[PDB]
Amino acid sequence: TDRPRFSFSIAAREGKARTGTIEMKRGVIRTPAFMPVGTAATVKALKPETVRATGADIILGNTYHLMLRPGAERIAKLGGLHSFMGWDRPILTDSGGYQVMSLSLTKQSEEGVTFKSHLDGSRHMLSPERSIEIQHLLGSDIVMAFDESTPYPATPSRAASSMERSMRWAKRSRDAFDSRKEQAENAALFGIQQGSVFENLRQQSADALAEIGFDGYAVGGLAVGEGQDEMFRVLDFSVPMLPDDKPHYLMGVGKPDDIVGAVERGIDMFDSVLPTRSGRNGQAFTWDGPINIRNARFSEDLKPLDSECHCAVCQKWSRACIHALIRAGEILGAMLMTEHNIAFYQQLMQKIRDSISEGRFSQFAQDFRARYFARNS
Amino acid sequence: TDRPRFSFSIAAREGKARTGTIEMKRGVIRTPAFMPVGTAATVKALKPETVRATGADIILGNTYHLMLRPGAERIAKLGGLHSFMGWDRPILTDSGGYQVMSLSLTKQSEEGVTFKSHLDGSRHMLSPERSIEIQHLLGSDIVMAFDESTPYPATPSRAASSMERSMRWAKRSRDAFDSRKEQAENAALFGIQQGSVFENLRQQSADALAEIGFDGYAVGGLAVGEGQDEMFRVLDFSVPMLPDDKPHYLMGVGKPDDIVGAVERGIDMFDSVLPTRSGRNGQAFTWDGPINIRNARFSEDLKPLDSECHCAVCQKWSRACIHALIRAGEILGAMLMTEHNIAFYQQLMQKIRDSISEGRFSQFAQDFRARYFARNS
Ligand SMILES: [Zn+2]
Ligand SMILES: [Zn+2]
CATH class of the missing domain: 3.20.20.105 (Queuine tRNA-ribosyltransferase-like)
Structure with missing residues (x-):
């Protein structure tokens, strides 16, 4: 089927929030x-x-x-x-x-x-x-x-x-x-x-x-x-x-x-450059707020950067091993952190889209802030 | 001081075993x-x-x-x-x-x-x-x-x-x-x-x-x-x-x-090519015998490849993280294993030299075999 130049469709709303799609000739953009x-x-x-x-x-x-x-x-x-x-x-x-x-x-x-x-x-x-x-x-x-x-x-x-x-x-x-x-x-x-x-x-x-x-x-x-x-x-x-x-x-x-x-x-x-800039600087975003992977607390932490993140990094790599890579100056360390940070951002957007679709986005936003700012990482 | 072409000096003996030095123009070789x-x-x-x-x-x-x-x-x-x-x-x-x-x-x-x-x-x-x-x-x-x-x-x-x-x-x-x-x-x-x-x-x-x-x-x-x-x-x-x-x-x-x-x-x-060949193949030499770092048992093992090895790899890297590198096909994994294996060989030679010098090499050899072959790694 032929693809349009630019078609914005809103699928669901909650208050001022909207979720939907922008269709373009080179692909579909899910929104937000x-x-x-x-x-x-x-x-x-x-x-x-x-x-x-x-x-x-x-x-x-x-x-x-x-x-x-x-x-x-x-x-x-x-x-x-x-x-x-x-x-x-x-x-x-x-x-x-x-x-x-x-x-x-x-x-x-x-x-x-x-x-x-x-x-x-x-x-x-x-x-x-x-x-x-x-x-x-x-x-x-x-x-x-x-x-x-x-x-x-x-x-x-x-x-x-x-x-x-x-x-x-x-x-x-x-x-x-x-x-x-x-x-x-x-x-x-x-x-x-x-x-x-x-x-x-x-x-x-x-x-x-x-x-x-x-x-x-x-x-x-x-x-x-x-x-x-x-x-x-x-x-x-x-x-x-x-x-x-x-x-x-x-x-x-x-x-x-x-x-x-x-x-x-x-x-x-x-x-935002934030996910990439943070990734190069040894900072990872998590649902419990950002963490500094250089911190000594992570050197034996076998859990992934975020235990609810489903990026490819968190399926495989522990905080302890990313810590070791970053502390050694290994480029792989920065690459893994950056991949996770960008994927975490996309998972944030997906949770935003899904919650709007289900009419529970205002609750998601409250839940998100309480946990993100408590920083129980 | 000027350096000789080739001068072999024996410093100490135990039975047929000898320890000493070969002096050459480009440096000293410790023996064995x-x-x-x-x-x-x-x-x-x-x-x-x-x-x-x-x-x-x-x-x-x-x-x-x-x-x-x-x-x-x-x-x-x-x-x-x-x-x-x-x-x-x-x-x-x-x-x-x-x-x-x-x-x-x-x-x-x-x-x-x-x-x-x-x-x-x-x-x-x-x-x-x-x-x-x-x-x-x-x-x-x-x-x-x-x-x-x-x-x-x-x-x-x-x-x-x-x-x-x-x-x-x-x-x-x-x-x-x-x-x-x-x-x-x-x-x-x-x-x-x-x-x-x-x-x-x-x-x-x-x-x-x-x-x-x-x-x-x-x-x-x-x-x-x-x-x-x-x-x-x-x-x-x-x-x-x-x-x-x-x-x-x-x-x-x-x-x-x-x-x-x-x-x-x-x-x-x-x-011998053994230390290098093993290192590329995910096998590490230890005082408790060789280990296959791909084995699942090592995936959460925070101890170094060998807990008595003082190579630069064992100061820093855990079995768990070398395991992760090797399983991912990361060249760093093979490099770390190879460095440790060659360093382990040199530490073996140093222990051989020291034990001959102290006249306790035959005991070292017995101690070594009992532990190397028991394989309590
Ligand atoms: Zn992740
Ligand atoms: Zn070592």
Whole structure:
């Protein structure tokens, strides 16, 4: 049977939480979804088949890093990110705009930005048009509109002007995407809501995005230093402003309890480097909270990282042996921790989906928090 | 202080057993000595610094395999085996003659042998003169005379003729070695006693070798299928025939109890692939006998491979975690087992040396056998 470009179906709801599917030409994405951050398929990283076996339906590509090395045109000549990452299922790319704020910047205006590569100092340009074109060259299935991030905390004036520029750039992203037939017929485009902590600015942003029209809507400007309390407060009024029948995407979030609370507030999609960064640093996520595998307590602990996790690592490896690998600096140790962490995240999402489907998600969320924060690991 | 070409000193004796040192220009060899079989310094093998840290004072090079790949001239152009194996301490090379019997053979005569490479079918030639020259090109510190092996079991006639040819070839090895000033002044040459299980042939051989004169004397024709009982019986009368004040070398032996009994019979030097072959196959040597680390009993065994071994593996790794590595096919598992096995062999030799020095070696040998064969692992 033929597969659609982008079809979001909601199968069940509990309060603001939703569970369902996004059907795309390269596969189905179960929601709520967690997207691990992808990298080149080399001996340095988990194999793509390993990432898929953790349960991931889609992975994320960082446009900014790919355009500095090896470059978007080079990626295209190699067959796009799907070949480059050895991943034939959907790929979401960010716009590159956040990293130019956080990692580089030679010129800024309504036109776009010019920035210096922190690698070789070379100059690069991004704009709604260039960002959408680069994401096309990467073979992206879900394209993010290019917006303006204002650093945290933002004044009411800075938040107002960045949101308004972002909305003008959202229309430009829309038109650039629509102008490219191969991209418009085969990929999807998400808009990004801005407005910082100000409800009227968030509503303005949401109204603008809905008038332009997108396949999905992200909540931007959070997870940038504000803390969970205020992030939840902003989600409380911001997510209901977005179109109900399209996916809602909270970018760069986050810790497991962040994810649970955001789903309670209507978020459908997530990404975070946390599982990978933690895995390389010897920290494992468990249902009893995170653990530091280097701790002496684990040196003779024959139980797996998490006794309820069904990832391939926990079927086989004890805390004691992962402890030994990590303490010796063996790369296998980091690989096992990273595989478990990504798989744990997918099992979290699966438990979220199942509990919403059964109408017991609010109880799952309470059960989850009580145990995650008690830390009886 | 300047170092001698070859100086064997006996420090202490108990019965036929001796302990002491061989001083050579590239270092001191403690005796009785075990020589692991060396290979090229690549990611496939233990690093040379690891092999040294196990206690090895000297390693063995298989001339036959090195002459098929990459070839003796190629080894020389790379700086000899010391550069090729990353090992700056003494290296003993065999003559290549045993492997032409056991692994290849297009022509055989009193002149030498011509054989077909089991790799690429190419033709090669060995002779006392060519073998000594190749071992020179390899940078060998201890050179083995080229002899004729007769397969086991040998008729009294075949044993007689092979021994006599070997003695004529021993003189030719001696003269070839002596003809090359750079080799004669910096390396040593061992002769090889033959005669199978026949006492008069062994005496004939020993007399011939002593008349030629060598720096050391090997007992050949054992560990080829005969079993330990008969090997010990042959050693009982064969080793006393050799010059007392030169090292005695039992080639290709062997299991730990073989080594102990051979030292009781006057052997000073040993080599065997057993520690490495076992390590790759998941078998570890211990004071309670060998263990198969794949056995289910080890999956939760937090004790090291051997609780009295002081190798770097046993300081750190449990049976349970080596078990997990081996069962997963992780190369680290084989590396750890091989390091422990070679280190265990060196600790065996150290206990042999110390017990002889203290005049308690015969008691050590009895204690060792009772525990090794009870197998309370
Ligand atoms: Zn797991
Ligand atoms: Zn050990």
